[PDB]
Nucleic acid binder design. Structure first.
Ligand SMILES: [Mg+2]
Ligand SMILES: [Mg+2]
Ligand SMILES: [Mg+2]
Ligand SMILES: [Mg+2]
Ligand SMILES: [Mg+2]
Ligand SMILES: [Mg+2]
Ligand SMILES: [Mg+2]
Ligand SMILES: [Mg+2]
Ligand SMILES: [Mg+2]
Ligand SMILES: [Mg+2]
Ligand SMILES: [Mg+2]
Ligand SMILES: [Mg+2]
Ligand SMILES: [Mg+2]
Ligand SMILES: [Mg+2]
Ligand SMILES: [Mg+2]
Ligand SMILES: [Mg+2]
Ligand SMILES: [Mg+2]
Ligand SMILES: [Mg+2]
Ligand SMILES: [Mg+2]
Ligand SMILES: [Mg+2]
Ligand SMILES: [Mg+2]
Ligand SMILES: [Mg+2]
Ligand SMILES: [Mg+2]
Ligand SMILES: [Mg+2]
Ligand SMILES: [Mg+2]
Ligand SMILES: [Mg+2]
Ligand SMILES: [Mg+2]
Ligand SMILES: [Mg+2]
Ligand SMILES: [Mg+2]
Ligand SMILES: [Mg+2]
Ligand SMILES: [Mg+2]
Ligand SMILES: [Mg+2]
Ligand SMILES: [Mg+2]
Ligand SMILES: [Mg+2]
Ligand SMILES: [Mg+2]
Ligand SMILES: [Mg+2]
Ligand SMILES: [Mg+2]
Ligand SMILES: [Mg+2]
Ligand SMILES: [Mg+2]
Ligand SMILES: [Mg+2]
Ligand SMILES: [Mg+2]
Ligand SMILES: [Mg+2]
Ligand SMILES: [Mg+2]
Ligand SMILES: [Mg+2]
Ligand SMILES: [Mg+2]
Ligand SMILES: [Mg+2]
Ligand SMILES: [Mg+2]
Ligand SMILES: [Mg+2]
Ligand SMILES: [Mg+2]
Ligand SMILES: [Mg+2]
Ligand SMILES: [Mg+2]
Ligand SMILES: [Mg+2]
Ligand SMILES: [Mg+2]
Ligand SMILES: [Mg+2]
Ligand SMILES: [Mg+2]
Ligand SMILES: [Mg+2]
Ligand SMILES: [Mg+2]
Ligand SMILES: [Mg+2]
Ligand SMILES: [Mg+2]
Ligand SMILES: [Mg+2]
Ligand SMILES: [Mg+2]
Ligand SMILES: [Mg+2]
Ligand SMILES: [Mg+2]
Ligand SMILES: [Mg+2]
Length: 97
RNA sequence: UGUCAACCGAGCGUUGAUCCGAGGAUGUCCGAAUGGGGAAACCCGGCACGAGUGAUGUCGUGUCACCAGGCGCUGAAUAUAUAGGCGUCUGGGGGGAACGCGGGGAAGUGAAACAUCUCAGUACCCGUAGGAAGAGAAAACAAAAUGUGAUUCCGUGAGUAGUG
RNA sequence: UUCCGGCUCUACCUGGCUGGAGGGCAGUGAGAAAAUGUUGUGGUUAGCGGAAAUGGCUUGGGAUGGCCUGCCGUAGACGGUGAGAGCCCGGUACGUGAAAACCCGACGUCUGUCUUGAUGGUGUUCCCGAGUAGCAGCGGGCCCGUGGAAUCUGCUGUGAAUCUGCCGGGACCACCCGGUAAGCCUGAAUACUUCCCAGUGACCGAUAGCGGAUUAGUACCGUGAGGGAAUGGUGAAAAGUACCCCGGGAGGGGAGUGAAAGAGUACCUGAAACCGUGCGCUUACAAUCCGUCAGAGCCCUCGACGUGUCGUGGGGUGAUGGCGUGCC
RNA sequence: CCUGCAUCCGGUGAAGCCGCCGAGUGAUCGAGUGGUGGAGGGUGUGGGAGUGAGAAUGCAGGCAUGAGUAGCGAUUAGGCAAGUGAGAACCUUGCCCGCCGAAAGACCAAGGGUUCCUGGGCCAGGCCAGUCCGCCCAGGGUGAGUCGGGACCUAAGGCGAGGC
């Protein structure tokens, strides 16, 4: 999907637009991902009762990977003549990701 | 780590999971059912080779219909010979929405009734194969033109020549 | 328009029969059939690459809304993404691309007739598809519904000829004209979709649409053939209301979630029959297909004028008089 | 209502619904205004309609009166003390009374399949309330050389290799 676990991502649209974050888990079936620090929601937990803060899934279409230089970039692909492994490339820079 | 539909506990994966493409094995029982039996999915055996017990009782893998056509042997009352009887190979028993071929084959209804007719060779049934089928190489038309030249399928030829 | 051999009883010359070797002929073929040795980016069964705005200002819960600036276009088809997206995502134009297998086409051992044979003439003796053709009786379908009844055909009797032979031109005779049945194969033009792949709708949107948007030919009914049902929309995510209180629960009130809780799993929008609570007017001496035309009082209201009184004023109620025989 | 064409409106609130105020000679109209809602609509000119309800003893769904009226499904009949629990004439214990007793009792085959026991509760059901249940939940429960059948034999009848 051009997005993996452990990458750095930025939000384009939504309540928390303009905030950077780090991805935790991915859901390819529903095309949704979970990012900490964005879309924080209050949940009622009762067993002892209280209110806690958690994170809800965000659709990937509203987020995209950031460049190592701190700028938003798309994802490109290249073919290596050495091993043939497919690599991710920053379109606006050409550097590998 | 499919799904109805959350939830728990358990785990794998960079040494390539999951997925999809092609081929390959296993495939309980019934179901043309074909070792024998029978109220579908339940009862009972023969033979050969293996496994187990001091021996029976037990268990695994094979094989054990019928019909027709070839091939070989045999030849009754009865003599020639046949029928019949044995051994061995080759084929068939059912299913499928529509499409074809050859037969059988109905009644409602119109005629303001109704026997002839029409409904109709329709519905249905029977025996049949295929991916298509059937038909097919003039004992054919026409009429004085020195004409066409296997078969099949469409449009006209006309709702006319006829028939009731 | 090749060579040799053995045969036409036999050995020798003449004329014929049959085998072994060039050179053509075709071959998966209806004209004969079986197998065995080397090519197409031919397509198909998956995939992969694939261009351009985090633009500014505004309403906003959310921009994919409005105004102004850019860029790509062999890609402004189509869907998803928190409200109508060419430049966010899935992909579309275009390019590529397969281990194995499929089928088609082309390139290669092998099979077999003929060259013992072909070409143009002549008079004589034999052949050209048997219970068939035709004839007579009884039935079919051709427009022909036995009528004069041609042709084809089913059954029963009788029953013919081989080239100056035979059958056909709607009876039939004569003359002309066409043809050679009584044996067998033959692709192309045509008919259809239980299945699979790709596409379309001035076709339907939950009493419509296939009987079937959900437990579907299920439940259910019938011992049988068989008949045959109704049941979608919370919201962006469940964040499905912690906690406190009344209470057995059911159920409810605060406080929070959220845009809304006039969204609380009985959850979009919520009409009419139907049942209500509060408010205003009226009725207990009355003979009404239940309305209309007049019509005092009371109440609500809009203006100008003041305590309430008029006005090219509106509304609800109606005490009381006249009129008055539902719809198809 | 759906459509070709040219236009305008719309999260600063589009579609229905409920009012007020008005308007046309009709089937009606309002780009005039108020509440509810949240996602597509109007005008102009052409083309196509499953295009207009009150009645067929019509059909699908919902709801009126009779009505808080009749009944609450026999020929025996209950009463008392105590207990459980929020609730008891209908549940548990104890004591009186009555009834059946060729059955209103104890069993077989046919007939149903979990109604049997233990433990849980009482929004569905029991013609009323239910602590109870032939309500449901979860678990457990069915022991044959000698009992009934098969491996033993046969009838009225069915199948039927050959065959007619
Ligand atoms: Mg497979
Ligand atoms: Mg096996
Ligand atoms: Mg069998
Ligand atoms: Mg059998
Ligand atoms: Mg045979
Ligand atoms: Mg003999
Ligand atoms: Mg068959
Ligand atoms: Mg008549
Ligand atoms: Mg008549
Ligand atoms: Mg006819
Ligand atoms: Mg075939
Ligand atoms: Mg033919
Ligand atoms: Mg023929
Ligand atoms: Mg004609
Ligand atoms: Mg805004
Ligand atoms: Mg925009
Ligand atoms: Mg489009
Ligand atoms: Mg989207
Ligand atoms: Mg749309
Ligand atoms: Mg893709
Ligand atoms: Mg006739
Ligand atoms: Mg005639
Ligand atoms: Mg003539
Ligand atoms: Mg001639
Ligand atoms: Mg002939
Ligand atoms: Mg054809
Ligand atoms: Mg509806
Ligand atoms: Mg039945
Ligand atoms: Mg809120
Ligand atoms: Mg409801
Ligand atoms: Mg509602
Ligand atoms: Mg009075
Ligand atoms: Mg009077
Ligand atoms: Mg009157
Ligand atoms: Mg009167
Ligand atoms: Mg419309
Ligand atoms: Mg607009
Ligand atoms: Mg709005
Ligand atoms: Mg509003
Ligand atoms: Mg709304
Ligand atoms: Mg128009
Ligand atoms: Mg019009
Ligand atoms: Mg018309
Ligand atoms: Mg209509
Ligand atoms: Mg009506
Ligand atoms: Mg009704
Ligand atoms: Mg009534
Ligand atoms: Mg009463
Ligand atoms: Mg009574
Ligand atoms: Mg009773
Ligand atoms: Mg009691
Ligand atoms: Mg008694
Ligand atoms: Mg007695
Ligand atoms: Mg008795
Ligand atoms: Mg029984
Ligand atoms: Mg039983
Ligand atoms: Mg019990
Ligand atoms: Mg209980
Ligand atoms: Mg109860
Ligand atoms: Mg009940
Ligand atoms: Mg129970
Ligand atoms: Mg036993
Ligand atoms: Mg018999
Ligand atoms: Mg037989």
């Amino acid at each position: 999907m051009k997005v993996h676990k452990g990458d750095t991502v930025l939000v384009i649209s939504g309540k928390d637009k303009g905030a950077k974050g780090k991805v935790l888990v991915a859901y390819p079936d529903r095309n949704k991902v979970l990012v900490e620090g964005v879309n924080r929601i209050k949940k009622h937990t009762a067993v002892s009762g209280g209110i806690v803060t958690q994170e809800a899934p965000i659709h990937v279409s509203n987020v995209m990977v950031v460049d190592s230089d701190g700028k938003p970039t798309r994802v490109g692909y290249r073919i290596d003549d050495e091993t043939g492994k497919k690599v991710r490339i920053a379109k606006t820079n050409g550097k590998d990701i």
